[PDB]
Design a protein around this ligand. Structure first.
Ligand SMILES: Nc1ncnc2c1ncn2[C@@H]1O[C@H](COP(=O)(O)OP(=O)(O)OP(=O)(O)O)[C@@H](O)[C@H]1O
Ligand SMILES: Nc1ncnc2c1ncn2[C@@H]1O[C@H](COP(=O)(O)OP(=O)(O)OP(=O)(O)O)[C@@H](O)[C@H]1O
Ligand SMILES: Nc1ncnc2c1ncn2[C@@H]1O[C@H](COP(=O)(O)OP(=O)(O)OP(=O)(O)O)[C@@H](O)[C@H]1O
Ligand SMILES: [K+]
Lengths: 33, 193, 54, 94, 346, 335, 335
């Protein structure tokens, strides 16, 4: 081509913890503080 | 600091002192003396104890088990890099915190300071509209600073877990005597933290 | 303000300053302080080694 | 790496059944651990480090983690052709 | 400048002093990232990454086809035929060992290396029994030549792009405005560091501003050119020593309105885009700089940077942005232009 | 019915016939040029087919060579263990069947060369075949490496991706009629030394009685110094002042509908990322020019940095503009 | 008696000297760039030096490697085979000498592989060094191949050969002065879109104090459409008249004998076959221009076809001329 109930927040909590939101800034806060 | 700081500035001309601001000089006399009396010594003592203990535990676990000497090359080097990363990142974040709280408290200094001048100036309710941004404008930075510290711990935590697996393999590999394996495993668990 | 230097001085400033800080505060730090700290740490390590040996 | 939008503000995780795949894959990894584990126990009992039991499993745990990493990367960076390659890989194990 | 301190975001900076196009596109029709894109990223890597991908690719191919060969020498009942130590190898001749003297995966891997990189130690040759092995050998050699060619192309193209090191064209970090030859003039300094010349050079100066129209339309980011004031009206320039590229404004250009007080609140931004083809490389390069209102130190005049040494001229580059604040009239942009009764408003 | 074909299709690709052109034939240089300019899905096939055909053909020749000297004939009738077979004039040691000869080829050309299959100096035919095989192998290898590299080298560029606006607007500007279209970009590297040109193409006569069915009449893009060059990093509106010297003078909205006309816009420049020249074109027909629909702004003012959008590219708000001629526009400027 | 410093030496090659340039640095990758463009004499030695080095280095990593796994001793103590069977643990079969090791080294990094030195699979370090040697060999081979191709790609372009006559003249054409050099060409292919620019370098004070030290004006050249293009087959004479607008307008008969003038001429363009841009620069200082003698005819119609003669490239003859200045000659009719 050119281009159901299962809802919870444990899964975000289980595999998206304390390391993503600031990940880009923390590695490379050089000259863009 | 006390004998030297006073000694340096007593013998000088009034022109420069009345040309550069007084506030910075007062700060140099007060805040920095507080920091060096109160802050630098305990920080240095704590840092030296922690660094030396981490080095000692790593050294113990490497002596007690020969494979550790090869095994210990990559991980600590990566930790070195990560250390430098935080060694700047949060520094910048602390700077951000250092200023983020300057205006907002002064605003609550203002609205209160205008005890009656803004009481019935018909602009009272619109005042909340702007106020409700500053609070967020500060707590947002607060969470970011907290998050930087958290990220370091998480990275550190996973690094620590890797060391334990290595030591465990080494211990079953070592099997020299119960005393050796016990000391090695316990010190790895100590260095974890 | 001195952004090029600040980038060059992004980190790894402390050693010269801290050396001024420590030396003044401490003469013969290497044995009086440094030596005591190293001795205590090695003593704790030897305590562990003796516990293993026993 | 190879006209560009935000990295993650809006497109956090939009792909078909995003909640489900991770939910299952974790179970597969745990099952693989038990298989190793089972062998890991079994190998001591057997005569000369027979490795049929342990490794087939070790390779599988590593492969499963790797598969998951490719789906996550394929997810952050939209590239739906990639996932087609992974589907063929999931079908050669069954 | 506490207002500017809280206004650090509000700022008319269309292009950053570095040169990039600080902008934001959105709501676009991103069709996807088709496969070939990844290959292009392969070309434009750096040496450490290119070397890593190179070596990793060779080793992955070798190990993979070694695993395949190991399976092959397993299924044909070959490893067992060798493992029978009734003799040194009692019945290992007639059984048609599919690949001669392939004993274990390590040995099969040695064979993979020996057959892909064209070494061929002879001690372990393909035999005349198993067609499956011949099929895998054909596949091995075809994939080997394609991978070899592609990696060679990658390494070569990172070699043939060694002419490009970095664009080095230098502007006066600040502008300058003054009076020269009787009328107001706008200046800027341009210099070069590379030894090689820049052929067919050209410069263009544009004003970016938000405009209004009598009919009613408003063009948010409006661009308008300005003359580059050369002697015979031509945007050519010879660049041996650095010089001063002065776009003096009379009436048509938008400098008639300028008032000295207004510069802090001024909304116009000057952009300079110059370009030319490098003589010894053949690449068309283009360098761009931005002159924001905060950097226009009005009233100054530029310094001289040419001295007679012994027989050959010497030139400095330290004094680029240094200026001597020669006195000049104030806000005469309209006063001096729209000549008063004196016709000498200065 | 069928409208007279646009001298330029909307996407470009001038669709004009070409009849009674004397054939230039063909040349094998052309076959090679077709080879180089392939796409991967066929290169990685023609390449493989060349290799496999090469190996099989030379293996057949090898089999014949090992047949004539009777290599096969000596080998097959073997006694218990081996006394008769090894010492006689075999031409290529240990080739005794096709598959064997095939393996000998695949060991000779691709340069593996194990060693179970050695070749002796007793059969001149064998020496000539070896030389020929090796030369053919080198030539095929060189040309295929050249092709693969040429793709790995010139795949730094992609399909021309330039976007013009859909429509065109006859609007009012500076108290005068005007012509406008939009030219944007989705590419990465800013075009270098770009230029824009506008050509009106319509059938014209000449007072000395001669017609020219598709004229071309360049027409001046407005600019404060009349410079065809144009900087572009955000979508732009390449304007066109209209005057009694410009070829659009005699049109009002009433007469627009059933009018034979066109506008072709061709702009050219060198992309710096690929370092290669390129030009893109569009063409607006009579029915495609929405009168009076002055263009809708795009660039906004975000806090730190400006911002643009692309969903609302061709939004045409409408404003009042005179529904009259251009000559009459200056005939009666009273109100 | 030293010549006052000249901005562009008579043989092109602008002789300026700027210092205090902030040392950008010496980029780690710079050697490679220098390595690409060498005299063929070096790129036929650094090849040999690189290959021979790598070979010897891996050989030493290799003779010793054979010793450590017990290989040297088994062969030496008894007979290789007469007294005893192989130890079977030899790392590489029959690898006898730190001579033999060197010979073996040639097989791995050169892809020849004889066969009398196999690689057994016991010693893992041997397998490690085999992987490493093979990777290094491939990287060195590819880099050298790319270098050799770059220096075979640039065998087409050789050197700018555009010849200006030695010195200028100054004469009268149509009752007005002029200024002439004589550009020309050497090789077969013409230049494309060749362009000419004349700049005068002078020390200009300003009526407002400023004194531009070495300031360069541009002056128009002669052409009936005021366009700087040109198309040369036989040497032309590119005049650039002097007038009230021109800066040379104040030159004089006596003053040119001791004067501050510098008329650089630049010529740009590409070459058709190579398709590469190029430019050429040269000059005319005060000593070099001698008034009143025009250049001499070249093109001569032979019996068969036109002939361009070079025997008198820069030959000069005197002709009538007035000794006044440019403003003097046009000062008054009677003047
Ligand atoms: N000798 C030089 N070497 C390198 N860069 C130079 C040199 N002279 C001028 N520049 C460049 O010109 C720009 C502006 O220079 P300016 O005229 O402001 O001199 P400056 O005040 O010393 O510059 P800066 O404050 O950036 O050092 C700077 O970005 C600088 O990079
Ligand atoms: N946001 C955008 N993303 C991609 N292309 C755009 C965008 N806006 C305009 N264009 C380009 O400009 C041309 C004219 O677009 P216009 O605004 O008329 O949309 P349209 O043609 O009415 O709808 P569509 O673009 O779906 O055909 C289109 O060919 C399109 O390629
Ligand atoms: N046959 C030629 N081929 C190439 N260049 C020539 C030739 N004749 C003269 N020239 C050019 O003339 C210039 C100076 O020539 P040179 O001084 O050697 O001889 P000349 O007769 O003293 O001077 P000129 O030849 O200019 O009158 C050189 O740049 C050279 O390129
Ligand atoms: K090239």
């Amino acid at each position: 081509f050119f281009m159901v109930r299962f809802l919870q927040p444990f899964v975000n909590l289980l595999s998206k913890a304390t390391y993503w939101w600031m990940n880009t800034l923390i590695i490379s806060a050089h000259r863009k503080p | 600091l006390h004998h030297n700081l006073l000694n340096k500035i007593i013998l000088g001309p009034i022109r420069f002192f009345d040309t550069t601001p007084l506030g910075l000089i007062l700060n140099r006399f007060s805040a920095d003396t507080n920091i060096i009396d109160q802050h630098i010594p305990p920080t240095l003592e704590s840092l030296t104890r922690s660094t030396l203990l981490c080095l000692s535990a790593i050294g113990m676990i490497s002596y007690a088990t020969p494979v550790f000497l090869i095994a210990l090359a990559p991980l600590g080097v990566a930790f070195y890099f990560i250390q430098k990363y935080f060694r700047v990142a949060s520094k910048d974040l602390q700077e951000l915190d250092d200023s983020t709280q300057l205006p907002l408290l002064c605003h609550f200094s203002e609205t209160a300071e205008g005890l009656t001048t803004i009481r019935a100036f018909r602009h009272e309710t619109r005042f909340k509209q702007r106020m409700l941004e500053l609070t967020d404008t500060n707590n947002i930075a607060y969470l970011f600073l907290s998050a930087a510290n958290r990220w370091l711990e998480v990275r550190t935590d996973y690094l620590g877990a890797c060391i334990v697996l290595t030591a465990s393999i080494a211990s079953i590999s070592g099997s020299s005597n119960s005393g050796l394996v016990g000391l090695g495993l316990l010190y790895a668990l100590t260095i974890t933290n | 303000d001195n952004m090029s230097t600040v980038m060059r001085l992004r980190t790894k400033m402390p050693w010269k300053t801290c050396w001024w800080y420590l030396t003044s505060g401490g003469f013969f730090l290497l044995f009086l302080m440094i030596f005591s700290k190293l001795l205590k740490h090695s003593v704790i390590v030897a305590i562990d080694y003796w516990l293993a040996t026993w | 790496g190879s006209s560009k939008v935000q990295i993650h503000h809006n497109t956090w995780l939009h792909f078909p059944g995003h909640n489900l795949r991770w939910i299952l894959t974790f179970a597969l990894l745990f099952v693989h651990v038990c298989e190793i584990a089972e062998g890991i126990v079994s190998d001591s009992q057997r005569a000369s480090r027979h490795l049929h039991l342990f490794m087939p499993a070790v390779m599988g745990f590593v492969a499963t983690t790797t598969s998951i990493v490719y789906y996550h990367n394929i997810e952050t960076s939209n590239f739906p052709k990639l996932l087609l390659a992974l589907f063929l890989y999931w079908v050669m194990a069954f | 400048r506490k207002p500017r301190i809280r206004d650090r975001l509000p700022k008319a900076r269309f292009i950053a002093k570095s040169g990039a196009c600080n902008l934001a596109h959105k709501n676009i029709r991103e069709q996807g990232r088709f496969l070939q894109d990844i290959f292009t990223t392969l070309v434009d890597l750096k040496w450490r990454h290119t070397l890593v991908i190179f070596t990793m690719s060779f080793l992955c191919s070798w190990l993979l086809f070694a695993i395949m060969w190991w399976l092959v020498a397993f299924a044909h009942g070959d490893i067992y035929a060798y493992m029978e130590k009734g003799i040194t190898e009692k019945s290992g001749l007639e059984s048609a060992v599919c690949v001669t003297n392939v004993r274990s995966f390590t040995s099969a891997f040695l064979f993979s290396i020996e057959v892909q990189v064209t070494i061929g130690f002879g001690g372990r040759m393909m035999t005349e029994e198993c067609p499956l092995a011949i099929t895998v050998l054909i596949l091995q050699n075809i994939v080997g030549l394609i991978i070899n060619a592609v990696m060679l192309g990658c390494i070569f193209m990172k070699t043939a792009q060694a002419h490009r090191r970095a664009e080095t064209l230098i502007f006066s970090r600040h502008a300058v405005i003054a009076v020269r030859n009787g009328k107001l003039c706008f200046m800027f300094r341009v210099g070069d560091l590379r030894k090689s010349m820049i052929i067919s050079a050209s410069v263009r100066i544009q004003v970016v501003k938000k405009t209004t129209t009598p009919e009613g339309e408003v063009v948010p980011i409006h661009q308008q050119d300005i003359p580059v004031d050369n002697p015979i009206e031509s945007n050519n320039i010879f660049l041996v020593a650095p010089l001063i590229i002065c776009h003096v404004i009379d009436k048509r250009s938008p400098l008639y309105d300028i008032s000295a007080t207004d510069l802090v609140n001024q909304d116009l931004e000057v952009i300079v885009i110059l370009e030319g083809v490098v003589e010894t490389t053949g690449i068309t390069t283009q360098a761009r700089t931005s002159y924001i209102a905060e950097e226009i130190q009005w009233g100054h005049r530029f310094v001289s940077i040419v001295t007679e040494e012994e027989g050959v001229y010497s030139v400095d580059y330290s004094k680029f942005g240094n200026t001597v604040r020669v006195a000049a009239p104030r806000c005469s942009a309209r006063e001096l232009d729209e000549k008063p009764s004196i016709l000498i408003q200065t």
